[PDB]
Amino acid sequence: GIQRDDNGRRIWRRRTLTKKDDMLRYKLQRVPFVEEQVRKIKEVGKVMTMDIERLLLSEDNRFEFVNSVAAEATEYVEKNRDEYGGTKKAIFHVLSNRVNDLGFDRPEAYAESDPYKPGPGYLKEYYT
C-alpha cells in the first residue's frame, strides 16, 4: 500500500490505460469547415432550439415546463416593464437564464445585434 523512498516522499503507481482504445483515434479529429454553419446557426436562432430540448431532457412533463417558463416570464416583465419589449424578450430571457443556471454560457435572452449594419435607417433586407 503505502510506499516511500529515502527522501520520505510518497511514490504511487501512475494508473494508465494499458490496452489500446480503437475509438480514441477515430473521434479526436474535428472538421475544419463549419465556420459558416456555426455562424448561421447562431444568427438563425437554432442554438436556443438545442437549449430548449436540453431543458426538456431534465424535465418530467413538457406541459409543466412551459407553464413554469410562462409563469417565470410573467414574473420578469412585472418587475421590469421597460426591458422586455424589443431586442430582449421575456420568454427568451427565462430560457437563457435556465441554461445559465445549469452552468453553461449563453447571451442574455439570446439577443444578437448586427455588427455590419451600415446606418440607423438601413434595415437588413432578407434575400427570399
* DSSP letter (8 states) at residue 27: T
Using the rule CB under 8 A, is 82 a contact of another protein?
yes
What mask of x and - would describe binding to another protein in positions 15 to 54, judged by CB under 8 A?
xxxxx-x-xx--xx---------------xxx--x-----
Q: d(Cα 56, Cα 104) in Å, to the nearest integer?
A: 16
Q: Which of 8, 32, 115, 118 is in the footprint of another protein by CB under 8 A? A: 8
Q: d(Cα 16, Cα 23) in Å, to the nearest integer?
A: 17
Q: d(Cα 61, Cα 67) in Å, to the nearest integer?
A: 10
Q: Which of 12, 33, 63, 116 is in the footprint of another protein by CB under 8 A? A: 12
Q: Which of 29, 35, 79, 123 is in the footprint of another protein by CB under 8 A? A: 123
Task: Tell me which amino acid residue 46 is.
Answer: K
33: cell is: 469547415
Which CB, 91 or 97, lies closer to another protein? 97
Closest CA to 88 of 56, 117, 113, 55: 113
Segment interacting with another protein, rule: CB under 8 A, options 5-13, 31-39, 63-71, 108-116: 5-13
Q: Which of 47, 68, 69, 97 is in the footprint of another protein by CB under 8 A? A: 97
